[PDB]
Amino acid sequence: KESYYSIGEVSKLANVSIKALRYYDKIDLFKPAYVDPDTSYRYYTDSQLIHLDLIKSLKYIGTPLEEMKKAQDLEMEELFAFYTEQERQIREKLDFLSALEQTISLVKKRMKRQMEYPALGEVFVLDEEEIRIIQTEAEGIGPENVLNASYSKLKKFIESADGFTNNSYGATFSFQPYTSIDEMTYRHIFTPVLTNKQISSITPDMEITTIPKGRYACIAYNFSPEHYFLNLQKLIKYIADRQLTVVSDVYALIIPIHYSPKKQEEYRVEMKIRIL
Amino acid sequence: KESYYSIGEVSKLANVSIKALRYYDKIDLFKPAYVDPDTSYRYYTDSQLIHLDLIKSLKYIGTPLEEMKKAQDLEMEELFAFYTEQERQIREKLDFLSALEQTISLVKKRMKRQMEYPALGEVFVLDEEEIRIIQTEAEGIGPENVLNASYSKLKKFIESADGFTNNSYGATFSFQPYTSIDEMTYRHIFTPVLTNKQISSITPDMEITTIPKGRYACIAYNFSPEHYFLNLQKLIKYIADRQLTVVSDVYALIIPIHYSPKKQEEYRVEMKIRIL
DNA sequence: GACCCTCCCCTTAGGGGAGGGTC
DNA sequence: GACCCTCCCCTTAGGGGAGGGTC
């Protein structure tokens, strides 16, 4: 009190690094009361340690340093408001995280569900829960025509809402006794929606709808141009055999298996058609 | 598909900056499929745009870039776990924020409560809600002896638990008909606790207790060595006059009014003594 | 005429030394 | 022998130009 504290003494007493103290000295946020002109040593009075209280508390909640310089000036009423502001920003970060957390969870449900598929190449008839999607007319686009770039607009809408970018790429087409793959063209191309947040301002060439909840004759396999059509053939036959009645387009989903620029690419395809 | 996309084309299609793309190219996170040897132009195939999906989703949740390079390698089962890890970290950040949010709120209740004090210099008898505190023996320390450095240990305990550092500094002393300020010495010095988180490992020279809930004869004023003692005198007299019976030490609280290295320092003092 | 490229400087809040005095 | 000081280099993920070619 009747002498000075060396920077190291303040460091131990305020539980603040010596390097932090020098830095706060440099940005004129908290400078020592006296710097020995010959030795350059920094000296602090006991009375000024109180200024480190407002600086540590603010640093704990994350406010920027230059932001603090404006905080030490303001009076108690103004500081009160300041905290009200911080509260607004924390609730913001909380909401962002809560939602994120849910999105991650949904991504995992679907990730695992496809991960533990009964078997590949086989036609399975299962009871599906609905899957909300955002689609758009597939202007002529066909199985041998689609490009990732074709989903660009769909992906930007889903991206603003979900933050996360779809894992799978969808397409739909009329159920017909297709002879060849060139005989087919997609009605719509779509991407699943995860979040339930409103899309900023969806344009009218996008439709928000769903793959209906219900019963579907499904089949999943690993992608190959030959297999895409051959497996569709199994479905077309499985339905003809059981004499089932289709009540929807054929839904086609293509999920990437790894996202590594190193390995050879491989996707998982999944075709479902709703039956009575 | 049968040609290449220029960096700008990819930029518009994936909603990723050109500068981001070059940077992902530099850190070998996502490099173009072909770079024209003479012009240096970067060229991307439609097929590789899919790698930006895993990169954008991860970037949205905050995972580091070099962290991503390890994510694109791992397979679907491993990626599933990865998300489980992210979920752990998000819940962590949520908890940190929730608590922070509460602490901020409490800081504001007290900040305002003292902010809208009835009047200064007057003795008010009010019904107080308890205030949990952490105290320590005040080894000889007296009104003209205390230093901020005296609260160093107390402050480090409260700091690990509350994150926030106490606003006020407390002291207590036996209630006596004090003749002079030199006649007094503090029994304990204390600092209020906000959070209800357990202190890592409090040492036995610290006591976790409280200023009891109950009725107190209080007085708040602006600090001055003369006023500290003169106002105590009002309290000593107010109790003698009303013939009240004190049932606790005199509690002394000192709150800083501004934390600015510019303005002259000024504190708010507040003395309360519990009566029957 | 738009596009694209390669430097180059800049941003938060310090932590890590290294070389050289000082309480 | 501890302490303290002044450079100096380094860290994330790019955004901003500037000077100079290119689709």
Curated annotation (Swiss-Prot), chains A, B:
Q: Which SUPFAM superfamilies does the UniProt record give?
A: Probable bacterial effector-binding domain, Putative DNA-binding domain
Transcription regulation in keyword set: yes
HTH merR-type domain span? 4-74
Q: GO terms for biological process?
A: regulation of DNA-templated transcription
Q: Keyword annotations for this protein?
A: Activator, DNA-binding, Transcription, Transcription regulation
Name of a matching Pfam family? GyrI-like
Keyword Magnesium included in the entry's annotation: no
Report the DNA-binding ranges: 7-26
Q: Per its UniProt record, what InterPro entries does this chain match?
A: DNA-bd_dom_put_sf (IPR009061), GyrI-like (IPR029442), MerR-type_HTH_dom (IPR000551), MerR_fam (IPR047057), Reg_factor_effector_dom_sf (IPR011256)
- Report the superkingdom from the record: Bacteria
One GO MF term on file is:
DNA binding
Fill in the subunit field for this protein: Binds DNA as a homodimer.
**Could you identify this protein by its name?**
Multidrug-efflux transporter 1 regulator
Organism in which the protein naturally occurs: Bacillus subtilis (strain 168)
